[PDB]
């Protein structure tokens, strides 16, 4: 592996410890193998749907495959990738590439009394895509993910153990039904809960501490 | 929009009363005239005397010659056209036979293949067509 971007040089050599440091400064990832370096031993992908858009040509219709894959580590990191290519293998290869570049941390909370590890979504959060609306509601411990099969796959990649779910809109569209539930999951860290009201002590940027190393 | 007053129960109750009638499922079960023209009279099965045997052509994209029977129901005197499971099962039916007749399966709508027939024959001469076709029983005449 030849690190070609500046983040890649900082992750090939041991100075960036965890992937949360990338997420804390909202730094954009540009390579797939940056995710593989930190926690790549547990990523499992699932080809949800292959859906070709048809552009008819002068010598017959051209069949170009869109691929929908979802991937996670079952501990709080989930992503969804959409990539369009000609054949089956290239489309799913490009889709897991873009799914790796869209890995989002997942905030988990408790239903009540806050014992042990968190298990549910912290609050009622909603995802919207197309006409499809997907709502995630927290549940007591050991309830299970009360969902359709398409969000049952996505929610289990994110490591969420319990969830009440509702849907509205034309959920037959699997692309919109999987993109909307990914929007609801990624909106868990976009919502300000009163346990995060503290005055934020700003942490030194990773670009500026390792300034001497990027010189060489 | 919808009125949200505290003292608007009478208008909210009366409006929902009138707007229920505009659903055809609610009108069929409640007006009562959808059970008067039902040949079964709101029942699940009905017995009748076989009048004759006829054949019914199928739809245009799937051409077939399906064979039915004309049976006159006892309790109300109405004529219905009933379907037999195959052409082999027609060997066990003769005219002036008492047959027990059920619906085909979609609460009043016809077959997705052959139009015009809404009912299927369950028993003939007080024995079942499944036991007759599988050789389990013999029917009296």
């Amino acid at each position: 592996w030849m690190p070609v971007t500046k983040l890649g040089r900082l992750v090939k050599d041991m100075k960036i410890k965890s992937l949360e440091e990338i997420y804390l400064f909202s730094l954009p990832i540009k390579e797939s193998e940056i995710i593989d370096f930190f926690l790549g031993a547990s990523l499992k992908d699932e080809v949800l749907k292959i859906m070709p858009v048809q552009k008819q040509t002068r010598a017959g219709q051209r069949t170009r495959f869109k691929a929908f894959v979802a991937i996670g580590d079952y501990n709080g990191h989930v992503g969804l990738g959409v990539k369009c290519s000609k054949e089956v293998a290239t489309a799913i290869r490009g889709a897991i590439i873009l799914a790796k570049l869209s890995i989002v941390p997942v905030r988990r909370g408790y239903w009540g009394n806050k014992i042990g590890k968190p298990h549910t979504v912290p609050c009622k959060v909603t995802g919207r895509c197309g006409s499809v609306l997907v709502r995630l509601i927290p549940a007591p411990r050991g309830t299970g993910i009360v969902s359709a099969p398409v969000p049952k796959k996505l929610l289990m990649m994110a490591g969420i153990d319990d969830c009440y779910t509702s849907a509205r809109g034309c959920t037959a569209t699997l692309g919109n039904f999987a993109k909307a539930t990914f929007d609801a999951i990624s909106k868990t860290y976009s919502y300000l809960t009163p346990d995060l009201w503290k005055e934020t002590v700003f942490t030194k940027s990773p670009y500026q501490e390792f300034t001497d190393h990027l010189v060489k | 929009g919808k009125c949200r007053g505290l003292r608007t129960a009478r208008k909210l109750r009366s409006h929902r009363r009138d707007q229920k009638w505009h659903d055809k499922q609610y009108k069929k079960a409640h007006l009562g005239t959808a059970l008067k023209a039902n040949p079964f009279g709101g029942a699940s099965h009905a017995k009748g005397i076989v009048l004759e045997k006829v054949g019914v052509e199928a739809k245009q994209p799937n051409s077939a010659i399906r064979k039915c029977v004309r049976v006159q129901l006892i309790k109300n005197g109405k004529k219905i056209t009933a379907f037999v499971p195959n052409d082999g099962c027609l060997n066990f039916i003769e005219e002036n036979d008492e047959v027990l007749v059920a619906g085909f399966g979609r609460k009043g709508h016809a077959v997705g293949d052959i139009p015009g027939v809404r009912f299927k024959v369950v028993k003939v001469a007080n024995v079942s067509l499944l036991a007759l076709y599988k050789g389990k029983k013999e029917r009296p005449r």
Binding site: G112, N113, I115, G116, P140, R141, G142, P149, K152 | -
Partner: protein, 180 residues
């Protein structure tokens, strides 16, 4: 007017989705190492858990010092400790939601006989219970799904009137010895 009682219940609930690959395999896993006859013995233990879980989450929404929460929370927790699915130090209403099906299925008389070394397999245990070879305290039990309390755990004996117990030989051994 009769002197009869008509009150009766259903002890199981069929799932809404009849054919899904994830639920079919988790149920088959439970039939495997617990030696059950059908899916109904899985759905029965699944149903008795949801009745307990519903009672727990109804008491939890009540405030802490409510006297119905204190009486019936203590009553519910004592019943779970008594059948041996809860530890002594885990007496709280929040720990009930952390139970699973496998904790209840481990307390059956079929499982306890296999765990106590009275049988060679979980299926050998089931046929041994049914054939009147196993007693608890002083009472012979046919029912494999007999849930064993903690006080009955160390008293699962081995049936003094059985060939494997007191010593009267069976029908097969008696018939065979008559041949010679």
């Amino acid at each position: 007017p009769v002197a009869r009682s008509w009150v009766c219940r259903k002890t199981y609930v069929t799932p809404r989705r009849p054919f899904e690959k994830s639920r079919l395999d988790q149920e088959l896993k439970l039939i495997g190492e617990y030696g059950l006859r059908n899916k109904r013995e899985v759905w029965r233990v699944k149903f008795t858990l949801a009745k307990i879980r519903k009672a727990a989450r109804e008491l939890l929404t009540l405030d802490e010092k409510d006297p119905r929460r204190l009486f019936e929370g203590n009553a519910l927790l004592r019943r779970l400790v008594r059948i041996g699915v809860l530890d002594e130090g885990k007496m709280k209403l929040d720990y009930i939601l952390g139970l699973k099906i496998e904790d209840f299925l481990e307390r059956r008389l079929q499982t306890q006989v296999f765990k106590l070394g009275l049988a060679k397999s979980i299926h050998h245990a089931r046929v041994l219970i049914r054939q009147r070879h196993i007693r608890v305290r002083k009472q012979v039990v046919n029912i494999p799904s007999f849930i064993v309390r903690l006080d009955s755990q160390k008293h699962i004996d081995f049936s003094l009137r059985s060939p494997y117990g007191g010593g009267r030989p069976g029908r097969v051994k008696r018939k065979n010895a008559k041949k010679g």
